[PDB]
Symmetry: D2
Subunit: 249 residues, 4 copies
């Protein structure tokens, strides 16, 4: 089908839990061979889950905070395999008023959210250019469009990956590489645990989401498959928000 | 299926040619019963094509420039059927320097591009609210985001339908009606024949499109099906550009 | 100075009260001769206020709901005077759930908010093109970017004037006519009386505005003068939001 | 005066040439005491120009590529003065296809364009919060909104500073610190010399600019003064494009 990922090989970062894990499973169900990339061996679980369900997968363990090491691993893979799809999902958020953010903490967020996404995009994207086709989907955020509260480095980094998306689409679309972003709204995962623990804040958020409910990681799967599939072949340099109407509120 | 329209009934306006015709066909292939709505009997041919192609379709003939008439037809269809999906595709464009635009010509563009989309959205949308479920997809444009040249009324109308998309999503998402837009880039259709008449203007446009080619109507089908399907159930109030990277250039 | 409007003649619509009245006064203080355009004779008051303060002004009474009449008046003026600046401020908002909006009420909002702005822009803009310079500033809205609640026609119309702004800037910037928009956030005026009367809604809004306070009409003056002045001579087709940070929240 | 900077102290980075130099001068003319911050002693010349031009200015020499050093300098200046305005203008650009971009070159761009703006904003901003008042204006770019060509790191960095602008505005507006950005279009400066080296590339750009001309650094001054003045006191979290209509084309 036009929505099929049969015959593709997809790398999905931060595949150990949350949105990444759901996308890894979803891609496998869609027919892709999945490289689940994670920071710890716990991603081997996911690879096993996929296998035990009839799917095709394997684990990659490499800490994206280590850019040099990440680049080595990605280049190895890009050369060793025909990777058709990259999903830049790994990300971290640090909540603290701007005045209190140390340079170290600012850089830590930017390293994983932006720099690593760049390193992987460059590595796998360069091989995609050589094969005449590929897709790269980066997980963005509501904070790719808005400032939020107490997450300045996060907001900067999430705006940044949208710039990276547009730049790479501009340069690479004509050579068969489709680069886009998927911006989740408010999703029930570990990254929002502290947020949801604040009853008042969580109620404020919920009241504002037009759909009236937070997302599950599964809500991100349909759109992630779409963006990696033939069905999105003329879609380039876009950010598709999956946010229950948040950006319209 | 996550991307299936099996069991749905869809109304597609401007279904007689170009983008609407392609969407009508694609929706039928995805399992929808299609009500092909057009201004002339030409749309009966489309329903017939879909028919002996193995699909399910009927034709609706009604001039969207007649809003009172359009409302009557939409309301009756909404009351005698269960219409799950509406695609607002009918649109016209008038090219002329803004200084030369008569009020009548301004009005003619807004009536079809904006007012008619409103009347149909209100009519089918009201019934969707009662059924607890539905999707509305409006065909926007690059000129929903930029000014272009010699198309002031068109740009105004295409920004306006994005505003409408956002307003209805904000109001209706929480009641199960998913309202979104699809913004085509430059597409080979009767609507751009006058534009492409000038080979130099055409090539100038192509040079600017990152993908290096104009779209065909078929390029709009995958995204149109996605936005009407279960895979997009948390997508609300969004404008998905299908534009070969234009907006990123 | 670069921020001076000395020697200019400015038309300001909806100048009888609120944002328009404050802009009329502000422009006069900046040195412009002001044509205060209103729906009723109450705008003669404003013209008198300006005069009694040492400024230069006069009243224009013409109901913008009457497009034909508006066009006659604007064309008369455009030919009779050297109008350097037009501020399209007149506007109406009608709050009601979308399902309940009649076609008549939809059209009423679009007529004043969009059609009239177009008629005046075309009339005065055409004369500006002939004189080799001019500015047009249209009052937009937060609902030029977002859907809001219970104001679908308003949102459509306010998105639309942003399209009109971009289109006219695209066509006319090179011939000396600077066309831009000013998008107010939440302002204490008659148009928000019903909103502010709802204690809970008003508190919701206030909590969301980062600056922590609603705007006064006076908050719009500095930006309106800026956009009409030599200081903004390379600013074209932009929407400057004056919103206390609303769009960043 | 609504547009006066009389009695203010302003720090302008990259003040040695181009846009920064022009802003330094314009701020001085508007009555500000200017701290012209540059990487080399060249900026002492600027302070001297301002001086015998009748203005008030000092020079600060500090390489923004050295973030630990930049932080020390900014913190000391913030503690020993009352700095009312910060203009983050220092920026660099590196042109090269993304496939050819080394991690070091990527980092060099982000360090100056993003990280340094962060360090200074945090340093001066913290003191502004304590004084209950301040303005921060960051120089963004067209590539804060589009991908451009052969400038992936630059586009990422310029989107990022918009994210930062929005985050700080969201957090700080309610405490009297107005944080905004100014996005120049194509400007005749050393930063675009390599671009303009090719007369055909230059003319191609000009053809696309609605205003029909590239900007000069002086085109940025009026908007820069506006954003730092009382006239913009309700403007928060905004990016004002000064681009001859580029973004509308
Ligand atoms: N949840 C939301 O509402 C929301 C909204 C907007 C955007 N997003 C984005 O969506 C993405 C998915 O995250 P999530 O929501 O699903 O939260 P999550 O599952 O709880 O955590 C995200 C994943 O990133 C991984 N990761 C972090 N640093 C890594 C590193 N240096 N190397 C390799 N992997 C690393 C985590 O693995 P480890 O735990 O082992 O470190 C984890 O698997 C993130 O980029 C996030 O920013 C989420
Ligand atoms: N082509 C592009 O590059 C582009 C870009 C952005 C958006 N769009 C939009 O895509 C949509 C489809 O246009 P198209 O490109 O596919 O060209 P098209 O082949 O001419 O499609 C437009 C259709 O609208 C129908 N229509 C016009 N007025 C009508 C009315 N009063 N009542 C009922 N139907 C009416 C036309 O039917 P009749 O032939 O009988 O009049 C025609 O079938 C439009 O909204 C258009 O604005 C196109
Ligand atoms: N207040 C906000 O928060 C906000 C936010 C976004 C945008 N805006 C826009 O800012 C603009 C200013 O309005 P406002 O806030 O200052 O409210 P307002 O002063 O209470 O009312 C606006 C003005 O529009 C005039 N007007 C309406 N219809 C007219 C017509 N057919 N012909 C001539 N004049 C007409 C009104 O005059 P009459 O009363 O005599 O009819 C009135 O003077 C509006 O376009 C509004 O949409 C306001
Ligand atoms: N020109 C355009 O079309 C355009 C468009 C959008 C944005 N911008 C932005 O406008 C700003 C100004 O650039 P410009 O156009 O005026 O060209 P410019 O004349 O080269 O200005 C850039 C300045 O940044 C300074 N700088 C670079 N690295 C520095 C460092 N590590 N520490 C301290 N200062 C440093 C440079 O000083 P040195 O000479 O000593 O290195 C230079 O004076 C930049 O942010 C730029 O990205 C320009």
């Amino acid at each position: 089908g036009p929505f099929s990922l049969a015959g593709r090989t997809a790398v999905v970062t931060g595949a150990g839990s949350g949105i990444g894990r759901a996308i890894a499973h979803g891609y496998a169900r869609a027919g892709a061979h999945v490289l689940a990339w994670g920071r710890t061996d716990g991603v081997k679980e996911v690879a096993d889950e996929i296998a035990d369900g009839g799917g095709s997968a394997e684990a990659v363990v490499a800490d994206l905070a280590d850019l040099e090491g990440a680049a080595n691993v990605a280049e190895e893979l890009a050369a060793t395999r025909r990777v058709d799809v990259l999903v830049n999902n790994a990300g971290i958020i640090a909540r603290a008023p701007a005045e209190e953010v140390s340079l170290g903490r600012w850089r830590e967020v930017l390293t994983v959210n932006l720099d690593a996404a760049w390193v992987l995009s460059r590595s796998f994207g360069t091989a995609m250019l050589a094969h005449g086709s590929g897709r790269i989907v980066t997980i963005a955020s509501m904070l790719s469009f808005q400032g939020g509260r107490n997450v300045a480095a996060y907001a900067a980094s999430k705006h940044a990956v949208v710039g990276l998306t547009r730049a790479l689409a501009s340069e690479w679309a004509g050579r068969g590489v489709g680069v886009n972003a998927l911006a989740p709204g408010y999703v029930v995962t570990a990254n929002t645990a502290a947020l949801r623990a604040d009853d008042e804040r969580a109620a404020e958020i919920t009241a504002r989401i037009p759909a009236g409910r937070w997302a599950t990681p599964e809500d991100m799967v349909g759109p992630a498959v779409f963006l990696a599939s033939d069905a999105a072949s003329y879609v380039h340099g876009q950010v598709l928000a999956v946010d229950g109407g948040w950006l319209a509120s």
